[PDB]
Design a protein around this ligand. Structure first.
Ligand SMILES: Nc1nc(O)c2[nH]nnc2n1
Ligand SMILES: Nc1nc(O)c2[nH]nnc2n1
Ligand SMILES: [Zn+2]
Ligand SMILES: [Zn+2]
Lengths: 188, 180
C-alpha cells in the first residue's frame, strides 16, 4: 500500500497515447461513446469521459469507470479523465496560466462526487450525453447534488451542455443493463 | 505513466498506511489524524488529513492527506486518498461489502462537495470530523456547493456523522498553516 494506483486497461492506454483531434461536439462525444462500449467489454461500467482542448479539439486525456475492476469507488470516468489530464499537463489546475481552456466531455451527467471534481479541476466547459434520469433508471445513483447544480456550474464560468448524442448513450446504458446479470448469456 | 493514474505518497504517509495502529477512542483516532495534518504541511501539502478505521476496534486501515499541488491532481483530497487506499487494502470498491467490519472515515475537516460524494459511494458507515466547514473557508479553502443539509444526506444513507471533535486543536493547525 504505497500509492493510489488505478490501472488503465489496454484500450484506455491506447486512447491516452494516440494523438487525436476532434473539432465538433458530436465528434468528441462519438469518441467518448466508443470508449463506453470498449469499457463495458473490459469489465467496467457504462461510463466514459475525455478532456479536450475546448478550442482546438485536441484530446488531452480519457477516462472510464474502473470502480469494480480497480477496487476504487472514486474511479468514475470523470475523475480518471480529469486526473490523467492534470498528470499529462503537470498541474492540478487545468485553468493555470498558459494552458488552453479545457472541456470535459462525458457520457452522462456527473454524480455529486464528479460535480465537485469538475469544479476543482479548472475545466471551463462540461458536455454531457445521457441525462441524470437515464443513468438512475438503470440503477446507477447520481446522489444528492445541490439544487440547480447546472446553474451552480454556470455561476463558476463552467459552461454546461447536456443531451448530446443522448440516444446513442441511452442505447449503451440499456445494453450494459441487459448484460448485467449473473445468468450466462452468450449474446453478451 | 502511460498505463495508470498513480498518485505517489510522501514517506510519512507510506509509513502511516503500513504501520500497525489500533486507536480505540474517537479522540485518539482524531489525534493521530491531526499528526498527519502537520506532517503533510511539512511535506508540501495542504492542511488536511483523513484516515479510515474499523469503527468498533479502531484498527487503522488506511490514511490520506491533501496531495493536490505536489501530486498535480485536484481530486487528491485527503478523504479520497484515505477511502481509496482503504478499498485497495481490503480488496473491494465497497467498504460495506458483506463480511467486512464497519468502517469509519475520520477527517481533519468537514468534506467538500466532491469528498461528500466520495464518502457516499465508499461504503463507510461513519464520518467523524474535527474542523467545521466555516473554519476551512476562513483560511481560504473552498468547500463548494454541497446540497442543503449535507449531513442529513449522509445520515439518510446510513452514514452517521460527528463533527467538532478536537476542533480547537485542528483549528490551531489551520491557523498555523494560513499564517505561513
Ligand atoms: N453515477 C455514476 N456512477 C458510476 O458508477 C460512474 N462511473 N463513472 N461515472 C459514473 N457515474
Ligand atoms: N476543501 C478542501 N480542500 C482541499 O484542498 C482538500 N484537501 N483534502 N481535503 C480538502 N478539502
Ligand atoms: Zn461520478
Ligand atoms: Zn474534498
Amino acid at each position: 500500500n504505497d500509492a493510489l494506483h488505478i490501472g488503465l486497461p489496454p484500450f484506455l492506454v491506447q486512447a491516452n497515447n494516440e494523438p487525436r483531434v476532434l473539432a465538433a461536439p458530436e465528434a468528441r462525444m462519438g469518441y467518448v461513446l466508443e470508449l463506453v462500449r470498449a469499457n463495458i467489454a473490459a469489465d467496467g461500467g457504462p461510463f466514459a469521459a475525455a478532456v479536450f482542448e475546448r478550442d482546438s479539439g485536441l484530446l488531452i486525456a480519457a477516462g472510464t469507470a474502473r470502480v469494480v475492476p480497480g477496487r476504487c469507488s472514486a474511479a468514475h470516468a470523470e475523475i480518471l479523465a480529469l486526473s490523467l489530464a492534470q498528470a499529462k499537463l503537470d498541474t492540478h489546475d487545468l485553468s493555470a496560466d498558459g494552458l488552453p481552456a479545457c472541456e470535459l466531455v462525458t457520457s452522462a451527467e456527473p454524480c455529486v462526487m464528479c460535480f465537485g471534481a469538475v469544479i476543482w479541476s479548472g475545466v471551463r466547459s462540461l458536455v454531457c450525453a445521457a441525462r441524470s434520469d437515464d443513468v438512475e433508471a438503470i440503477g446507477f445513483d447520481e446522489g444528492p447534488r445541490p439544487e440547480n447544480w447546472m446553474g451552480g456550474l454556470e455561476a463558476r464560468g463552467i459552461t454546461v451542455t447536456t443531451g448530446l448524442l443522448r440516444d446513442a448513450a441511452c442505447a449503451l446504458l440499456r445494453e450494459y443493463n441487459a448484460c448485467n446479470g449473473v445468468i450466462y448469456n452468450a449474446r453478451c
